[PDB]
Structures are given as structure tokens and as C-alpha cells.
Design an enzyme around this catalytic site. Structure first.
Site, mmCIF file in Angstrom:
data_model
loop_
_atom_site.group_PDB
_atom_site.id
_atom_site.type_symbol
_atom_site.label_atom_id
_atom_site.label_comp_id
_atom_site.label_asym_id
_atom_site.label_seq_id
_atom_site.Cartn_x
_atom_site.Cartn_y
_atom_site.Cartn_z
ATOM 1 N N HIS A 1 0.805 -1.220 0.000
ATOM 2 C CA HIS A 1 0.000 0.000 0.000
ATOM 3 C C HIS A 1 0.850 1.288 0.000
ATOM 4 O O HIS A 1 0.269 2.351 -0.145
ATOM 5 C CB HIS A 1 -1.082 0.027 1.105
ATOM 6 C CG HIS A 1 -0.587 0.166 2.515
ATOM 7 N ND1 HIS A 1 -0.062 1.362 2.990
ATOM 8 C CD2 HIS A 1 -0.646 -0.720 3.536
ATOM 9 C CE1 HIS A 1 0.222 1.147 4.264
ATOM 10 N NE2 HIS A 1 -0.091 -0.100 4.633
ATOM 11 N N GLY B 1 2.264 5.724 10.401
ATOM 12 C CA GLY B 1 3.676 5.586 10.066
ATOM 13 C C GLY B 1 4.310 4.271 10.502
ATOM 14 O O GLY B 1 5.453 3.984 10.143
ATOM 15 N N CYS C 1 3.313 1.142 9.666
ATOM 16 C CA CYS C 1 3.126 0.069 8.677
ATOM 17 C C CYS C 1 4.489 -0.399 8.192
ATOM 18 O O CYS C 1 5.381 0.423 7.960
ATOM 19 C CB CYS C 1 2.255 0.541 7.513
ATOM 20 S SG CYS C 1 0.622 1.174 8.002
HETATM 21 O O1 QHI Z 1 -4.378 1.940 8.632
HETATM 22 C C1 QHI Z 1 -3.433 2.637 8.271
HETATM 23 N N1 QHI Z 1 -2.408 2.978 9.080
HETATM 24 C C2 QHI Z 1 -2.274 2.747 10.460
HETATM 25 C C3 QHI Z 1 -1.711 1.594 11.008
HETATM 26 N N2 QHI Z 1 -1.588 1.349 12.319
HETATM 27 C C4 QHI Z 1 -2.028 2.274 13.160
HETATM 28 C C5 QHI Z 1 -2.628 3.494 12.760
HETATM 29 C C6 QHI Z 1 -3.071 4.480 13.677
HETATM 30 C C7 QHI Z 1 -3.611 5.652 13.228
HETATM 31 C C8 QHI Z 1 -3.741 5.897 11.867
HETATM 32 C C9 QHI Z 1 -3.331 4.970 10.951
HETATM 33 C C10 QHI Z 1 -2.758 3.740 11.364
HETATM 34 C C11 QHI Z 1 -3.334 3.204 6.855
HETATM 35 C C12 QHI Z 1 -3.858 4.651 6.833
HETATM 36 C C13 QHI Z 1 -5.365 4.662 6.911
HETATM 37 O O2 QHI Z 1 -5.965 3.926 5.824
HETATM 38 C C14 QHI Z 1 -5.420 2.705 5.518
HETATM 39 C C15 QHI Z 1 -6.174 1.859 4.719
HETATM 40 CL CL1 QHI Z 1 -7.764 2.341 4.222
HETATM 41 C C16 QHI Z 1 -5.696 0.628 4.321
HETATM 42 C C17 QHI Z 1 -4.442 0.245 4.742
HETATM 43 CL CL2 QHI Z 1 -3.863 -1.346 4.336
HETATM 44 C C18 QHI Z 1 -3.662 1.063 5.533
HETATM 45 C C19 QHI Z 1 -4.145 2.306 5.944
#
Ligand code: QHI
Ligand code: QHI
Lengths: 305, 300
Positions: free
Chosen positions: A41, A143, A145
Site C-alpha cells: 500500500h 507511520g 506500517c
Molecule cells: O491503517 C493505516 N495505518 C495505520 C496503522 N496502524 C495504526 C494506525 C493508527 C492511526 C492511523 C493509521 C494507522 C493506513 C492509513 C489509513 O488507511 C489505511 C487503509 Cl484504508 C488501508 C491500509 Cl492497508 C492502511 C491504511
């Protein structure tokens, strides 16, 4: 004495963490040999995330679009390919800090250490379990991921998890290192929800054995039960079924403490039906289910890495 | 989102762990530059435990009595000296993996990561707090002596604890890296007991703020309290007094969540009075006190 939630030493994994930037997105990558693995992603923007055709997006990318940074050194990407939900960025330099490693896919109930990272820099390490609903109850902010879950076996790192997303309830979903998600999740912005979670019964029993090893023995009773009668009660309280495999794995702890597995199950059965009555076990008022039997043996025997 | 007990990444500390053997005793040492720091009791025998004279014992030792092993390489001891309860073994090789570091003495309530080691090899890492009674509730077996507690800020490791011993209740006592014990403890087999432990109140408040940040609000109430009234209640539950310093440190969390410190204080008084009524806060049925205000802001 003492029983703590203990992660594996993270040194072998810290030497693999790099920062991967593609356009406006910056996340973490795992640099092993001459390949950097990261969530696919990283190549998405806003429209892309809603309905992404990753094969189409990756075809439009060139190696120079990927900015990989290991410490203060920029690595040059010389190839890119996708394996399921993970992106593999071939680089011109093999990581000199590459440890002995394997990619393993773990099962629900299994535990692993998470090295939470931001901008390719490790910020924390914690222990957690793959829930029966295939989510992890981690601690991750934007951040993180690309942060990886791992175990250490002798001098070998087994990478079992890569963080991809956060679900609406605050729990986390990710993939193994071959890009296959744990659970019925997808790497796209859509309505996704974790299934009703259940308690990891074998790990609760292992934790009760760790409590007996530490002298906490108030919950022990004279009773035993059949595996079937226990499993009937386990189902009632949203506890995972206990298999003969689980009974066999708890064998060494059963031999060490003198408490048969089904004897411990009758203790657990009474705990479920009657509660703790104001008492605690290993400083906790809830039954802890994120210590596997191997974790209890490793900690209560001092296995080193 | 999510809140976990999180230790610092231990890599910078793993590269410093060595094995120190003196006669029949083998424990862990911390190799920084050309010095290996370890508990001085490594020089003790059977009858030199109830009342050891460490200065007298160390004078009888030579550099060749200390066997230091870093990985599979034997380090050669070229000097030895004692600083309080820590032994400093000068070696002929500077640790190439020496990180940026500082020696810091911490106060009760402060947290740190422990890298548990046996025979100079790291086996696990966990997060701890210095209890108000100056013990740590660690997880240590025989041979863990010399295992260190640390924090990492940016690129620098602040070493704050070295494990020396386990008290009769199963809790642990140790020193800072200058050999000064935390608490009224001594490195000998004499009768020693930890004082009655109390709950780190400022850390519980910080954890309730972490819970509000994570969407847990059930324990919130419309009440506020005076600082004195809160302390009179808190002390009855063996909770440490909350000082004006603690109220000031909780200021940023108070500003972020919109809940004044004394408002959170009244929520905590209520939680102490009613219990949790089958509910949990951040996956816990007890009030957690091993997250400082600094840890909460960092992790959130
Ligand atoms: O989840 C995600 N990041 C995060 C991961 N772990 C903790 C977070 C805490 C707060 C904000 C984001 C966080 C990203 C950004 C949001 O939208 C997506 C979507 Cl729709 C799909 C995928 Cl695969 C990733 C992500
Ligand atoms: O406590 C000690 N070692 C340990 C350290 N941490 C956890 C342990 C768990 C189980 C067994 C040993 C453990 C040593 C040996 C015993 O007696 C002493 C005394 Cl009397 C003083 C001092 Cl300074 C150290 C020690």
C-alpha cells in the site's frame, strides 16, 4: 521469580529496519540480504486506497520512485516486484547485518514480538498474540506500517508478521512475510470488521502453570474433568476449544508442577464459572492468554538468544 | 491506537552484554568502551556472603582471576577497581558496539526496560518501574545478576539499573551504574525486607489519560476534588501522595483530553471506591501503574 510479558531481544531485527518512501507515503521496510520487504500500500494515494489495482499501480512505478533509507544512507532500488500484499524492492547492497532468518506463518494463539518502527527507526518492542480472530491487539500510530513481528529460535529470526492496517475498533491487521493476510482482511479502504474474539485457552492454562511455578496457588482444586466436559464449558464462555495437541504441549509444565492438564482445566472451569473473588493471579485480575506454553517454559527456565 | 506495555528496542544494549566469571561465580557484565561493569558480589564465596568485606576480597584478586567472555572471544582484564557495589574491569579492547550512553539514577515511579541475560546472553526484554519501595518486580532467575535496566532517548542509552539480587518476597533489588543501591538494601545475605509497596498514583492518572485518548470514557465523572482531599482518600488505598509536580507533569495530557488533573483525580477516587464492576480499562481489570506520563505521551 517474577513473570513478565517478555519480548525476544530485538537487536537482530533492528539491523534490518529501513525507511521506504514512495511519493507522499513513508513507512517501514525490512531489509534482508539485497531485498527490502514492505506493505504494497506504500504505492497508493487517496483514490488508489478506495479501489486499488496494485498490479496496474506498480507497473506505472520505476525503481527511482522508491526512496529507501537505511540509517543515513540511501539505498538504490534496482528492481521491484509484488508477492501478494508485500512489495519486494531489490537493492544494490546486501544488508551486512542480515541475521539467520526464516519466513514462517503462525497460527492463532501463537505469540511473537513486535518491533514498532516509525521512519525506519525502532521505537519500541512488545509481545503479543495472534488472536483467534486473526487480529493483533498492538500499539501502533500512523507511520508504523511495515513494522514486523518475529520470534527467535536458537540464533534464527522467524519473521511472522508485517503490520498493514488498523481496524475501526483499534485492533490491527497484517500479513505474513509472503504478503498473505492473517484473517479475512484486505489492504483497501472498505468496511472491515474483526470477528468476535475468543480466549486462547491453551495459553491461559500455560499462564496458570506459570503462576503455580511462581507460588501463586489459591486457584488449585482437588478436581479433574474430561476434555469433552471442559470443552463444553469453554464454548459457553467464548474460550477456544482445547485439543489433545494442547494437552500434550502442556505435558512438561504438568510434570514440573505436579498438576495434570485436566486437573488445571477443572481449576480454569471453576475460575470461569465463579470469578476471582477479589483475588489476583500473577498480579492480574483477568486470565492472561498471551503466553504460550513454550513462552512459559522459556521464561521460567532462562533460555537465551 | 492501542496501548501496550512496551520496552525500548534492546539492540544497543545486547551489543554490550558479556559473561563475567570469577572462580565458581558466573554472572553478566556490561561492556562499555574498555570497561566491563558487573555486580561486585561476583568476587564472593560461601562464607563471604553474610558479611563480605569487598575491599579486602578485591585486594586479594588479580586481573587473571576475572574471566570475561564477549561472544566466543575472551577479553583480557588489565585492571580492576570498585565503585560502591559495582566492579569495573578494565579490558584491553574497547567494545566496537558501544552506543552513545549515559549513567542515570532514576526516582521511584520511573520506568525502564530490562534486558534479562544469562551467561552474557540476552534472553528477553520487558518493561519495569522502580517501585516506591525501591524494588523492581522483575522476572529473574539465578545467573541474571548484571542484567541492566535502561531507557533510550533518540540515539542515546541511559543505563539506570543493574540487577544485584532477589529479596525473600520474590521482588528484586539492584543499583544504578555507579554501584549505589536503590533502596535500603545491601549486597549481602543479611536479613533484608522490602518496605510495604504502594501504588504509583501519577502513573495511574497518566494511564487513565491514555485510556481516554484510546476511547475509554466509562470511568469519567462530573466531579473534581482538591489535591489534599484526593491524597487523604488515595493514601487509604496505599496510593502514593500526588504532589504539585505530578499535577504539572500531567498538564499536557490534561490539555490534550480536556479533562483537568483534579477532575481525573475524582474519577480515580471513584474507581478506588467502587472497583471496576466487571469492566476493564485498556484491557486490564486493575489500575496499571507502570506507565509514566512521559511513556503515555510517547506511546500515544
Ligand atoms: O491503517 C493505516 N495505518 C495505520 C496503522 N496502524 C495504526 C494506525 C493508527 C492511526 C492511523 C493509521 C494507522 C493506513 C492509513 C489509513 O488507511 C489505511 C487503509 Cl484504508 C488501508 C491500509 Cl492497508 C492502511 C491504511
Ligand atoms: O539473589 C541472588 N541472585 C538472583 C538474582 N535475581 C534473581 C534470582 C532468582 C533466584 C535465585 C537467585 C537470583 C544472589 C544469589 C543468592 O543470594 C544473594 C545474596 Cl545473599 C546477595 C546478593 Cl547481592 C546476591 C545474591
Amino acid at each position: 521469580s517474577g513473570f513478565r510479558k517478555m519480548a525476544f531481544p530485538s537487536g537482530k531485527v533492528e539491523g534490518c529496519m529501513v525507511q521506504v518512501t514512495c511519493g507522499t507515503t513513508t513507512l517501514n521496510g525490512l531489509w534482508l540480504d539485497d531485498v527490502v520487504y514492505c506493505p504494497r500500500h506504500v504505492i497508493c494515494t487517496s483514490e488508489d486506497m478506495l479501489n486499488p489495482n496494485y498490479e496496474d499501480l506498480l507497473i506505472r512505478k520505476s525503481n527511482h520512485n522508491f526512496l529507501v533509507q537505511a540509517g543515513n544512507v540511501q539505498l538504490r532500488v534496482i528492481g521491484h516486484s509484488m508477492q501478494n500484499c508485500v512489495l519486494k524492492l531489490k537493492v544494490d547492497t546486501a544488508n551486512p547485518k542480515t541475521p539467520k532468518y526464516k519466513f514462517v506463518r503462525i497460527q492463532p494463539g501463537q505469540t511473537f514480538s513486535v518491533l514498532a518502527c516509525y521512519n525506519g527507526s525502532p521505537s519500541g518492542v512488545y509481545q503479543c498474540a495472534m488472536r483467534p480472530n486473526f487480529t493483533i491487539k498492538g500499539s501502533f500510530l500512523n507511520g508504523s506500517c511495515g513494522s514486523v513481528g518475529f520470534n527467535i529460535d536458537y540464533d534464527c529470526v522467524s519473521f511472522c508478521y508485517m503490520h498493514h492496517m488498523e481496524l475501526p475498533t483499534g485492533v490491527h491487521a497484517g500479513t505474513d512475510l509472503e504478503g498473505n493476510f492473517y484473517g479475512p482482511f484486505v489492504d483497501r479502504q472498505t468496511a472491515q470488521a474483526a470477528g468476535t474474539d475468543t480466549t486462547i485457552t491453551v495459553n491461559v492454562l500455560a499462564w496458570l502453570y506459570a503462576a503455580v511455578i511462581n507460588g501463586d496457588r489459591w486457584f488449585l482444586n482437588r478436581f479433574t474433568t474430561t476434555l469433552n466436559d471442559f470443552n463444553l464449558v469453554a464454548m459457553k464462555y467464548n474460550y477456544e476449544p482445547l485439543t489433545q495437541d494442547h494437552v500434550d504441549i502442556l505435558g512438561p509444565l504438568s510434570a514440573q508442577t505436579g498438576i495434570a492438564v485436566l486437573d488445571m482445566c477443572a481449576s480454569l472451569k471453576e475460575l470461569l464459572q465463579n470469578g476471582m473473588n477479589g483475588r489476583t493471579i500473577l498480579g492480574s485480575a483477568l486470565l492472561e492468554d498471551e503466553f504460550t506454553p513454550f513462552d512459559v517454559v522459556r521464561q521460567c527456565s532462562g533460555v537465551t538468544f
